[PDB]
Design a binder for this molecule. Structure first.
Ligand SMILES: COc1cc2c(c(OC)c1OC)-c1ccc(OC)c(=O)cc1[C@@H](NC(C)=O)CC2
Ligand code: NA
Length: 133
C-alpha cells in the first residue's frame, strides 16, 4: 500500500507571458501602466505576496487552485508588460482586477492579506485615474 503519500499537491503552470502569435501593441497607456502603475505598486511595502504566483507547495495551500481557477499575480503582469503581450490597456487592467478579486474571494474581509490587497488597490485606482487619454 502506498497510501497516497506520492499524491502531493503541486502548482499549476503559471499564466502565459509570451506568445508570438498573439496580437500586441505598444500604446501610450500601456507604457504608463509599466513605467508608473506597475513600478509604483511593485515598490509598495505590501507588494510581496503579489509579486509571484501563489506557491501552494511553499504555503501549504492545497485548496487554493481548487477555488481560484484564473490565477494572476504582479510578476506575471510585469512580464506581460515587458514582453509587450497586451493589445490595449484594458487587457492589462483586467489582469490587475483579477489579481485583487482572487484575493477577496479566497480570503475573508478582516484578514491581513485582504487589507494588504485593499491598500494596493487604492493606490492602483489613484494611479489609473491619471491614465493618458
Ligand atoms: C504561512 O504564511 C503564509 C500563508 C499564506 C499566505 C501568506 O502570505 C501572506 C503567508 O505568509 C508568507 C497567503 C499568500 C497569498 C495570497 O494571495 C496572494 C492569499 O490569498 C492568501 C495567503 C494566506 N491567507 C491569509 C488569510 O493570509 C494563506 C497562505
Ligand atoms: Na472571500
Amino acid at each position: 500500500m502506498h497510501h497516497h503519500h506520492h499524491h502531493m499537491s503541486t502548482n499549476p503552470p503559471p499564466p502565459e507571458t509570451s506568445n508570438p502569435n498573439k496580437p500586441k501593441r505598444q500604446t501610450n497607456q500601456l507604457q504608463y501602466l509599466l513605467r508608473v502603475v506597475l513600478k509604483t505598486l511593485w515598490k509598495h511595502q505590501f507588494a510581496w505576496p503579489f509579486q509571484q504566483p501563489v506557491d501552494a507547495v511553499k504555503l501549504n495551500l492545497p485548496d487554493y487552485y481548487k477555488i481560484i481557477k484564473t490565477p494572476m499575480d504582479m510578476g506575471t503582469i510585469k512580464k506581460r508588460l515587458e514582453n509587450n503581450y497586451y493589445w490595449n490597456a484594458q487587457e492589462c487592467i483586467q489582469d490587475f482586477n483579477t489579481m485583487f478579486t482572487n484575493c477577496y474571494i479566497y480570503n475573508k474581509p478582516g484578514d491581513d492579506i485582504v487589507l494588504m490587497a485593499e491598500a494596493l488597490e487604492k493606490l492602483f485606482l489613484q494611479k489609473i485615474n491619471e491614465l493618458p487619454t
